[PDB]
Design a protein around this ligand. Structure first.
Ligand SMILES: CCCCCCCCCCCCCCCCCC(=O)OC[C@H](COP(=O)([O-])OCC(O)COP(=O)([O-])OC[C@@H](COC(=O)CCCCCCCCCCCCCCCCC)OC(=O)CCCCCCCCCCCCCCCCC)OC(=O)CCCCCCCCCCCCCCCCC
Ligand SMILES: CCCCCCCCCCCCCCCCCC(=O)OC[C@H](COP(=O)([O-])OCC(O)COP(=O)([O-])OC[C@@H](COC(=O)CCCCCCCCCCCCCCCCC)OC(=O)CCCCCCCCCCCCCCCCC)OC(=O)CCCCCCCCCCCCCCCCC
Ligand SMILES: CCCCCCCCCCCCCCCC(=O)OC[C@H](COP(=O)(O)O)OC(=O)CCCCCCCCCCCCCCC
Ligand SMILES: CCCCCCCCCCCCO[C@@H]1O[C@H](CO)[C@@H](O[C@H]2O[C@H](CO)[C@@H](O)[C@H](O)[C@H]2O)[C@H](O)[C@H]1O
Ligand SMILES: COCCOCCOCCOc1ccc(C(C)(C)CC(C)(C)C)cc1
Ligand SMILES: COCCOCCOCCOc1ccc(C(C)(C)CC(C)(C)C)cc1
Ligand SMILES: COCCOCCOCCOc1ccc(C(C)(C)CC(C)(C)C)cc1
Lengths: 60, 56, 97, 53, 68
């Protein structure tokens, strides 16, 4: 790791930009846990299930 | 022995943060100014916590 | 040859800690946690927002149904009720009688 | 400020800044602003910058 | 507003006050002299960092498993 970060030290633009995509990782970490237990309406899930198979409105 | 059992049991827990820890240590050794690292070593030789010193 | 139960030096050293208090040493040291975590700031705010929250809940949703829901939806409705009460749209936004 | 000193290899004194081969040093030598690049420190020896502290 | 007796603390005669004891050969022990014995925590700060990390992580693990 010291070699890699000693080279990051020598960069000019990537060392100040390539980290800005990292908050997005924590965004996913938080939203996934929000979604693991989200309470939803049974009627909408049975009427409009997301990416469920054999939905004729999709085609199959 | 029991020590080997504890080693092989705590291997997987103990090693989950070792990557990030070594990454931060190495990135500090690389990116940080060596005068700051020398001051840290000095303060630790003086029995002080250099992180608390820096915060203060 | 003292005929009384002579008290050791260390026992007096310890009792001096207890009897060498001044008035301010009690007043301010006990008033700071008290004023912060008292009927004015924290405990009062909490315990008086709860009353309005559960008034709103039992009027709008019901206490039994509220008990049946989850802790998350419980907290959601509690926060909505706290907002409804803090706003006080009917009192002209004024917490007065 | 301070001094640069050569001393035998081993434990580094706490507070000294190691000056290994490949280390660049901006200094002023006889009024001349210069860069000193360390190259081929001898074996059994190492170099460090010792501030006055 | 108030008579001089209340201000000076006596009506007629100023009474002597017994001075404070010192306990020679050792530190004073008062409500304000306790930092001599109890400093701010300084010994287990890095362990505090580690334990905070592990507590957060283990709590998140078991909470997510329970929720799922
Ligand atoms: C799990 C596996 C199966 C999963 C099954 C699911 C259920 C299990 C749930 C988790 C299990 C709990 C295990 C967690 C406890 C633990 O750490 O186990 C090891 C732990 C260590 O045992 P040990 O044999 O004495 O270890 C000796 C040395 O530590 C050995 O030294 P070492 O060299 O081997 O290192 C050991 C390790 C651990 O070192 C320790 O010794 C710590 C000990 C902690 C005490 C235990 C706390 C447990 C809390 C329980 C809740 O060192 C570290 O990794 C350091 C961790 C420091 C935190 C990481 C920080 C990452 C950076 C994040 C912040 C970044 C900020 C942004 C910066 C931005 C800058 C640009 O085992 C126990 O003590 C048993 C606890 C019960
Ligand atoms: C930030 C708000 C205060 C900033 C300036 C005030 C200040 O820091 O004074 C030191 C102030 C108190 O002084 P202290 O004696 O060093 O406190 C012990 C630390 O809390 C003991 O915790 P720690 O700060 O030494 O390390 C805990 C570690 C734990 O890392 C984790 O795993 C948490 C992951 C979060 C995602 O978290 C981090 O260090 C960085 C990750 C983000 C937190 O420490 C803090 O408040 C900073 C840490 C608080 C984080 C949660 C705050 C809620
Ligand atoms: C609970 C115990 C209080 C911990 C106070 C730490 C301390 O030694 O006390 C030290 C702190 C003051 O810290 P500082 O000297 O850094 O200002 O408070 C006091 O001096 C007296 C506290 C009296 C209340 C005791 C309870
Ligand atoms: C100003 C408008 C008109 C109103 C006037 C009256 C206002 C009264 C309110 C202020 C009261 C201040 O009260 C003040 O209490 C302290 C207690 O510490 C008294 O203090 C007195 O007693 C202590 C011991 O108890 C003695 O050691 C001290 O020498 C003596 O001053 C003061 O004499 C008094 O002045
Ligand atoms: C915020 O503070 C909370 C905790 O504070 C505890 C303070 O405890 C201090 C106790 O003071 C002492 C110290 C030493 C002693 C002894 C008896 C050991 C002193 C001796 C041996 C010189 C007589 C007695 C009381
Ligand atoms: C206009 O006046 C505003 C100031 O009032 C502040 C109120 O303070 C409450 C009590 O404060 C004290 C604390 C200690 C004392 C002393 C120091 C005189 C106590 C004593 C007699 C035990 C030494 C007096 C007042
Ligand atoms: C919950 O709070 C606990 C309140 O009780 C505090 C207990 O205090 C007892 C402390 O006991 C001692 C006695 C002596 C000492 C010495 C004198 C050894 C400390 C020293 C050498 C640093 C002065 C330390 C602690």
């Amino acid at each position: 790791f010291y070699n890699l970060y000693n080279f990051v030290r020598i960069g000019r633009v990537s060392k100040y930009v390539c980290w800005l995509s990292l908050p997005l990782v924590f965004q996913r970490m938080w939203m996934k846990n929000r979604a693991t237990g989200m309470e939803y309406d049974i009627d909408l899930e049975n009427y409009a299930p997301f990416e469920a198979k054999k939905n004729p409105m999709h085609g199959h | 022995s029991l020590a080997k059992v504890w080693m092989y049991a705590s291997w997987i827990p103990r090693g989950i943060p070792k990557a990030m820890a070594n990454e931060l240590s190495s990135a500090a050794a690389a990116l940080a100014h060596p005068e700051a690292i020398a001051r840290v070593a000095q303060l630790e030789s003086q029995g002080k916590n250099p992180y608390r010193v820096a915060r203060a | 040859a003292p005929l009384y139960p002579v008290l050791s030096q260390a026992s007096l050293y310890k009792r001096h800690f207890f009897k060498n208090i001044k008035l301010f040493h009690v007043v301010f040291y006990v008033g700071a946690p008290c004023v912060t975590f008292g009927t004015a700031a924290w405990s009062g705010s909490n315990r008086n927002s709860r009353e309005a929250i559960f008034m709103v809940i039992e009027e709008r949703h019901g206490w039994d149904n509220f008990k049946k829901l989850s802790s998350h939806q419980q907290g959601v409705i509690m926060q909505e009720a706290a907002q409804e009460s803090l706003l006080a749209r009917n009192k002209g936004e004024l917490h007065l009688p | 400020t301070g001094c640069v000193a050569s001393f035998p290899e081993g434990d580094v004194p706490p507070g000294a800044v190691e000056c290994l081969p490949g280390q660049v040093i901006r200094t002023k030598v006889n009024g001349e602003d210069v860069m000193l690049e360390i190259d081929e420190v001898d074996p059994g020896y190492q170099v460090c910058w010792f501030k006055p502290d | 507003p108030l008579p001089n007796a209340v201000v000076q603390g006596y009506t007629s005669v100023r009474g002597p006050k017994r001075p404070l004891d010192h306990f020679y050969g050792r530190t004073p022990l008062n409500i304000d002299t306790l930092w001599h014995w109890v400093k701010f925590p300084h010994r287990y700060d890095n362990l505090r960092f580690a334990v905070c990390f592990w507590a957060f992580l283990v709590s998140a693990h078991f909470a997510n498993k329970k929720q799922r």
